[PDB]
Amino acid sequence: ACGLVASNLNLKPGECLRVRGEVAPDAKSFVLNLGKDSNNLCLHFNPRFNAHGDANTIVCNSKDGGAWGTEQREAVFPFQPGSVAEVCITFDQANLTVKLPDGYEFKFPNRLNLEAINYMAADGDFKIKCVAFD
Amino acid sequence: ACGLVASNLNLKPGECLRVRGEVAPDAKSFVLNLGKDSNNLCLHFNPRFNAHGDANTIVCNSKDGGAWGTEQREAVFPFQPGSVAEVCITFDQANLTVKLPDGYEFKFPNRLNLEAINYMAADGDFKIKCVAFD
Ligand SMILES: CO[C@@H]1[C@@H](n2cc(-c3nc(Cl)cs3)nn2)[C@@H](O)[C@@H](CO)O[C@@H]1Sc1cc(Br)cnc1C#N
Ligand SMILES: CO[C@@H]1[C@@H](n2cc(-c3nc(Cl)cs3)nn2)[C@@H](O)[C@@H](CO)O[C@@H]1Sc1cc(Br)cnc1C#N
């Protein structure tokens, strides 16, 4: 975790986390992690421009006691090298809902049953401009 | 800090950090810490409504290897219990500049000669709602 790390977030079900940043002009990939701590992530949100054998694909996963879950890939890639992008995340007992920069929404299943999200971390080719907590 | 803790901020000289939060309805005092880590703070920003023998006074200090420096007190207190408040902070080699909710500005000397601020923490009667980087 070499980008921003925030802890003690106490983000509750139905509350909105908003992250705005600028995608690097030569971006390969970037990451937003949410969960309890670095080893227990309800969401690893990983847009891949050209990385790990994916092109223009969002890969999401969970991490439970340091172990990756099953990957989920999306049908849409509303990111552009160089461009500002905002991502909004909420959750309930069943899913996280991720709203992307073109307003497209997808759900990622809530695997860890967290009562609250206490940890967020950013990494890769995305410079954070702001974060809002409900 | 029961409040938000952020690390890897990489805030550079001349960049503006904007922190917006909610002052608790019955607020006694709150803290914003900036520096290298919890033991090495270029700014401990401590508005005291009624705490530690101060009434409606901003106390600022530095912390160097765990040691509190010489306290600085301000003549102005533009905070109200049960309100939103924003503080904006920048620095150079000589001083931090703190801009308060009514636009009042004061300087606090840069005693640790930090060339980046990597650590922020909130504590006490203030819930961080938003953080912006320039
Ligand atoms: C390559 O690693 C990635 C992981 N990764 C990316 C990053 C970073 N990117 C930046 Cl930017 C900064 S840090 N850190 N770890 C992660 O995205 C994971 C999600 O399932 O996929 C593969 S590992 C993996 C997991 C499973 Br399940 C199956 N196959 C593979 C692979 N390959
Ligand atoms: C009381 O403690 C405070 C310190 N403090 C406040 C908090 C918190 N407030 C919240 Cl809300 C959450 S955590 N934690 N530690 C700090 O503000 C310090 C600044 O100089 O003054 C005194 S200690 C001190 C330092 C010096 Br130099 C001289 N006298 C004293 C005292 N007393």
- Test A134 with B131 for CB contact under 8 angstroms: no
What are the E-state strand segments in A24-94?
30-37, 40-51, 54-64, 67-68, 72-73, 84-91
CA distance linking residue A30 with residue A23, whole number of Å: 8
CA distance linking residue B102 with residue B118, whole number of Å: 27
Best residue of A9, A11, A86, A133 to probe chain B, by most B CBs closer than 10 Å: A133
| Of residues B8, B1, B4, the one with CA closest to residue B133 | B8
| Of residues B123, B129, B121, the one with CA closest to residue B40 | B121
Q: How many helices (H) and strands (E) does chain B have?
A: 0, 12
User: What does residue B132 show for φ and ψ, rounded to 5 degrees?
Assistant: -125, 145
A4 touches B: beta carbon within 8 Å: yes
**DSSP per-residue string spanning A57-74:** EEEEEEEETTEE---EE-
CA distance linking residue A75 with residue A122, whole number of Å: 23
CA angle B27, B69, B5 (to 5 degrees): 50
Bridge partners (DSSP) listed for residue B97? B90, B107
- Test A133 with B129 for CB contact under 8 angstroms: yes
Q: Hunting for tokens 């920003």 — which residue is that?
A: B45
- Test A6 with B6 for CB contact under 8 angstroms: yes
In angstroms, what CA-CA distances link A93 with A74, A111, B17, B21?
Answer: 21, 9, 34, 27
Please name the amino acid found at residue A28.
Answer: K
CA distance linking residue B54 with residue B46, whole number of Å: 11
Q: Which residues contact A22 (CB under 8 A, 6 or more apart)?
A: A82, A83, A84, A85, A126, A127, A129
Tokens in use for A27?
Answer: 């971006």
What domains can be seen in chain A, in order of their start residue? 1-134 (2.60.120.200)
Q: Does residue A49 have its Cβ closer than 6 Å to ligand 1?
A: no
What does this entry list as its resolution, in Å? 1.7
Residue B12 is given by DSSP the state P
How many beta carbons lie within 10 A of that of residue B93, not counting itself? 9
For atom 24 of ligand 1, which residue has the closest CA?
A68
- Test B134 with A129 for CB contact under 8 angstroms: yes
Tokens in use for A40?
Answer: 């227990």
CB-based burial of residue A72 (10 Å sphere; 0-12 exposed, 13-18 middle, 19+ buried)? Answer: middle
CA distance linking residue B2 with residue A88, whole number of Å: 24
Q: Which chain B residue's Cα is nearest to A20?
A: B132
| Of residues A22, A42, A18, A26, the one with CA closest to residue A117 | A42
Tokens in use for B131?
Answer: 């953080």
CB-based burial of residue A47 (10 Å sphere; 0-12 exposed, 13-18 middle, 19+ buried)? Answer: buried
How many beta carbons lie within 10 A of that of residue A99, not counting itself? 16
For atom 10 of ligand 1, which residue has the closest CA?
A124
CA distance linking residue B128 with residue A120, whole number of Å: 14
Q: Which chain B residue's Cα is nearest to A15?
A: B129
Which of B44, B62, B63, B64 for mutating ligand 2's site (highest number of atoms within 8 Å of CB)?
B44
A12 touches B: beta carbon within 8 Å: no
